[PDB]
Structures are given as C-alpha cells and as structure tokens.
Amino acid sequence: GXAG
Amino acid sequence: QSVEESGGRLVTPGGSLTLTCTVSGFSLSRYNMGWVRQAPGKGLEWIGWIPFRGSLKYATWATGRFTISRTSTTVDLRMTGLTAADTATYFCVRSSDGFDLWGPGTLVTISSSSGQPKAPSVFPLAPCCGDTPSSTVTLGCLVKGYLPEPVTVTWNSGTLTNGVRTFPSVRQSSGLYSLSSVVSVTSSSQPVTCNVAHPATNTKVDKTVAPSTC
Amino acid sequence: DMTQTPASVEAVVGGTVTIKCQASRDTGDGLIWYQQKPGQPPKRLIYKASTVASGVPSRFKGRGSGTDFTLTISDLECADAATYYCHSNFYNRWTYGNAFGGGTEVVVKGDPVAPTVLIFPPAADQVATGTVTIVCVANKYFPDVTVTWEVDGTTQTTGIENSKTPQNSADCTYNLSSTLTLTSTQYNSHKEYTCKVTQGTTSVVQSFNRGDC
Numbered sequence: 001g002x003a004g
Numbered sequence: 005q006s007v008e009e010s011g012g013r014l015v016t017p018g019g020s021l022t023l024t025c026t027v028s029g030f031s032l033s034r035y036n037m038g039w040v041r042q043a044p045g046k047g048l049e050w051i052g053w054i055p056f057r058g059s060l061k062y063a064t065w066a067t068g069r070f071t072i073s074r075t076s077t078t079v080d081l082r083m084t085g086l087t088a089a090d091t092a093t094y095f096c097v098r099s100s101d102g103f104d105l106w107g108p109g110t111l112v113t114i115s116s117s118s119g120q121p122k123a124p125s126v127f128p129l130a131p132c133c134g135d136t137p138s139s140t141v142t143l144g145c146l147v148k149g150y151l152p153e154p155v156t157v158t159w160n161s162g163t164l165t166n167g168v169r170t171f172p173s174v175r176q177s178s179g180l181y182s183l184s185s186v187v188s189v190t191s192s193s194q195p196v197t198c199n200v201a202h203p204a205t206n207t208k209v210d211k212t213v214a215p216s217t218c
Numbered sequence: 219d220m221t222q223t224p225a226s227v228e229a230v231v232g233g234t235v236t237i238k239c240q241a242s243r244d245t246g247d248g249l250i251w252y253q254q255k256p257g258q259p260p261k262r263l264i265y266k267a268s269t270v271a272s273g274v275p276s277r278f279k280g281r282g283s284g285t286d287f288t289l290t291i292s293d294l295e296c297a298d299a300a301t302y303y304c305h306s307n308f309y310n311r312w313t314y315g316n317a318f319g320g321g322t323e324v325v326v327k328g329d330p331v332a333p334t335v336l337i338f339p340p341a342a343d344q345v346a347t348g349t350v351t352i353v354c355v356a357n358k359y360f361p362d363v364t365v366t367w368e369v370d371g372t373t374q375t376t377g378i379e380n381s382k383t384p385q386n387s388a389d390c391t392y393n394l395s396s397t398l399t400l401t402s403t404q405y406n407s408h409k410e411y412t413c414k415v416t417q418g419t420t421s422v423v424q425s426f427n428r429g430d431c
Contacts, residue, residue, distance in 0.1 A: 004246035047301075064313055102250030109259060127343065129353055131337070146397075171393070174379045
C-alpha cells in the first residue's frame with residue numbers, strides 16, 4: 001500500500 | 005479505539021527524550037502508526053510512519069536524529085539533539101487511510117535560557133466595586149509565571165463549564181508562560197473556585213474568587 | 219511537497235468556499251483532509267481524496283486526483299471555522315520533507331458585534347510580589363479589535379500581551395484577553411487605568427481608579  | 009502519548013517535559017538543550025504512544029481498542033499488529041508535531045501557532049509537521057509490515061519512513065529532517073519503534077502494545081519516538089526548534093506538541097496517530105486517531109498530544113519544551121520547572125502563581129480576577137449591582141458577574145483567575153506548559157484550569161471542580169472562557173497561554177520574554185480564565189455566573193454558581201494544576205511541579209491550587217465587597 | 223492556497227479565506231455564514239491542495243508529485247487518490255480547531259487535535263474529514271469520514275456532513279466535498287485537489291465547504295456554519303490541512307500518504311513511493319500541506323485558515327463571517335469590555339484590577343496579594351498584572355477582557359465581538367492601554371492618560375507601549383479565543387462555534391464571535399504588566403512601584407505611582415478596545419470607528423472603554431479597589 002501507500003504507493004498507488 | 006484511541007491512542008495516547010506520554011513523556012513530554014522540559015529538556016535541556018542538546019538532550020534526548022523518548023515519547024511513548026499507548027493504544028487502546030485495536031491491535032498494533034494490524035494497523036500502521038505515526039508521529040506528527042506542531043509548534044505553537046504553526047502547521048502540522050509529519051515526523052514518521054511505522055507500518056504494520058515493511059520499512060519505517062521518516063520526514064527527511066528527522067532522519068538520523070529521530071527513530072520510531074514498536075512493541076506489541078506501544079510505539080515510541082526517540083529524539084536526540086533537541087533544540088528550541090523542536091519545542092512543539094507531539095502527537096501519536098493511528099494510520100489507516102490517513103491519521104484516523106490522534107492522541108491529545110504531549111509537549112516537549114527546550115528552554116533557550118535552560119530554565120527549570122517553575123510553578124505558577126494564581127491570582128483572583130474581580131471587577132472594581134461598580135455602583136449598579138447585577139444578577140450576573142464575570143470573575144476569573146490569572147495563572148502567571150509557569151514553565152513548562154501546560155496548566156489546566158477548571159471551575160468549581162469541573163462542574164461549572166457554561167460561560168467559561170480560558171484564553172490561550174502567552175509566553176513572556178523571560179520564557180515563562182501565563183494564562184487567564186474567566187467565567188460569567190449568576191448567584192447559583194457562587195462562590196466560584198478556580199482549580200489550577202501544573203503537573204510539571206505537582207502543583208494544585210484552588211482559589212475561591214469573591215466579587216469585591218461594598 | 220504539498221502546497222495549500224489560499225493561506226486564509228473569509229466567507230459569510232451559509233456561504234461556500236473552495237480551497238486548494240497541490241502536490242508536486244502525483245499522489246493518486248492518497249490524499250486526506252483534516253479540520254483542526256485552535257487548541258484541539260486535528261480531525262480526519264475526507265480520505266481517498268473524496269470519501270467523507272463517518273459522521274462528517276456531505277457539505278464537505280473533496281475532489282481531485284493526482285497533483286491537484288480541492289475541498290469545497292458549502293452552507294458554512296460558525297462551527298466550520300478552523301484550519302484545514304491536506305495530507306499525502308504515498309510513503310512507499312515518495313520521500314517527504316512534510317507529508318502535510320501548510321494549512322488554510324477558514325474564517326466564518328457572522329454579524330458584526332461590538333465587544334463588552336471588563337477590566338480587573340490586580341488582586342491585593344499581587345502588589346507584594348513586586349509585579350502587577352492588570353487584565354482587560356473584550357467579550358463576544360466580531361470583527362477583530364485593537365487594544366490600547368492608558369495610564370493617567372498616557373498610552374502604554376510596553377508590557378502588553380494579548381490572547382484571543384477561536385471563533386465561537388455558535389455565533390462566530392471572538393473573545394480577547396489583554397494584560398498590562400507593571401512593577402508595583404510603577405503601579406502605585408499612577409491612579410487611572412484604562413483599556414480601550416477599538417473596532418473600526420467604534421471604541422469601547424473601561425477604566426478604574428487605583429484608589430477605589
């Protein structure tokens with residue numbers, strides 16, 4: 001997550 | 005679910021300090037967490053982010069002086085080389101599509117003049133004898149000369165909340181703080197008593213405020 | 219980094235504002251808005267750029283994607299007066315100096331109201347300490363005021379500190395505490411203490427005579  | 009920080013205090017310049025975040029109502033193994041700070045009158049500053057799996061991430065200014073770690077029940081923030089630029093309110097946060105839970109914050113204070121903790125003086129605030137008596141009167145307390153923040157002020161042991169105005173503290177040039185609180189009351193609330201606490205010095209003062217006598 | 223504009227915006231009750239958040243690098247829908255009232259922790263309003271958090275009213279409308287986002291607050295209430303922050307959570311893609319924007323202050327404009335003003339002489343036990351603090355409070359006013367202190371008719375230029383409460387969540391008004399600090403010697407050497415609170419062409423003045431209290 002947290003990375004597009 | 006909630007989170008709570010602890011450990012804020014006055015720190016000598018160049019000193020170190022570890023803050024602790026304790027959680028309630030959820031599992032640290034299933035949630036990311038972080039730290040944010042906010043200097044008085046300034047914006048939120050992200051410090052770092054500890055995901056439930058994967059690498060820690062830090063703000064570029066925090067890298068190498070601040071570290072974040074976990075246990076099964078807590079997360080911490082270990083700070084080194086603190087200066088007055090680091091004086092702020094520090095928040096732990098639960099992170100889950102953004103910071104969904106915030107602590108109340110804990111205050112880290114570096115004294116430029118390297119002060120030591122100083123207890124407040126508390127003074128009653130009452131108007132002069134005004135020759136038209138009223139059913140309502142505004143009374144207050146002045147809390148002067150303390151270090152570090154915070155103090156807490158309640159009225160009548162927390163039972164009087166309506167009509168209370170507790171102003172933001174102000175920092176004097178000396179580095180000390182002061183704060184005032186006033187409340188508008190009818191007779192049913194009188195006599196009124198302001199309850200002042202300053203945890204850093206274990207101070208608790210109760211001041212009953214009377215309107216001037218005439 | 220994250221850039222918010224305007225730095226501040228004022229709008230009438232019932233009105234609408236749109237504030238802007240610009241990311242220098244693409245942050246997808248990884249964008250969160252928070253509301254922070256002075257003296258309180260922030261509250262998450264909107265996540266994934268447009269999903270309102272539970273309990274948040276639908277008149278908070280987050281929009282955008284990539285590098286440009288907006289928050290539109292319509293039907294403004296006094297309770298909406300606050301500073302709003304955007305936040306990128308792309309921690310596994312980008313490094314950050316700060317993951318937050320700098321904030322936008324939203325000032326909600328209600329009806330103008332002149333203050334009522336109170337002055338509090340120093341308590342009897344203050345003078346013994348060698349310093350005395352006189353307190354003037356301007357209650358329930360909008361828009362902002364300026365405070366002047368006079369001692370025997372002479373305007374004071376030092377020793378004054380002011381502190382203001384946030385806008386009231388019910389009627390948008392402010393309260394202000396202004397303190398004048400003097401040595402006991404200075405205080406005992408004058409008679410008339412006056413606080414004058416000015417709001418444009420209006421002034422409200424409150425005085426006391428050191429002999430009478």
